Design a binder for this molecule. Sequence first.
Ligand code: ARG
Length: 241
Amino acid sequence: GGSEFQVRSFEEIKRSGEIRIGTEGAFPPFNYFDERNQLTGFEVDLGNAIAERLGLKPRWIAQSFDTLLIQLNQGRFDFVIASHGITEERARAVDFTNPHYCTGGVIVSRKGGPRTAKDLQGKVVGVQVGTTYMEAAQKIPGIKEVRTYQRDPDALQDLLAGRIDTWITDRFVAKEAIKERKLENTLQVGELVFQERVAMAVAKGNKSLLDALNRALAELMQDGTYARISQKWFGEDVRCK
Ligand SMILES: NC(=[NH2+])NCCC[C@H](N)C(=O)O
């Protein structure tokens, strides 16, 4: 049905009483569609909690990962929460909040397969488009072929099928996919290639909303709500530092 695109200040959002949140929905357990086809995950629970702390009704918009930061700047939504690591290149285009979790990227292979970056010379490596995983693979240039996917779970499918040697993805995403599919004797998590701080994003220059999100996040972190949502999803506290 389309929508009115606008980069909205915090007070413009408050007048409307609803906050528009962009996410992907193909990155379990952070943001994904469940078995009854409803949007859920750690970041959805956290997004909802942020909206509530700002006195706002959340309206969720799911779309392809590579589109998110473009449509944010175009005004499709007010903020994005979809597991973006903070990087210098992205910060040119969007403003990041303080990070809502810390993580890193790992090499995942079948048992006996490549464990570390130096082992990827001559191999086929699968990554999601526009990710810090793709960037890491582009920095391991002895790779025979970097196969890039629109959706991260498709790279995993190709790993299991033998079409790639190695999948580079989030450490929590890899751990859960292995538990979830009972792959403990099939796949092998190797080197932590890099660490990253993961944050919400607002349109470039949208400082009023940026400040309001940071205030809400700090409030969730002090009032136990963040700790509760992190326990629910991970059985541990996943906050930075
Ligand atoms: N919703 C998603 N599929 N997100 C992928 C994010 C992956 C990685 N943390 C990055 O910053 O690029």
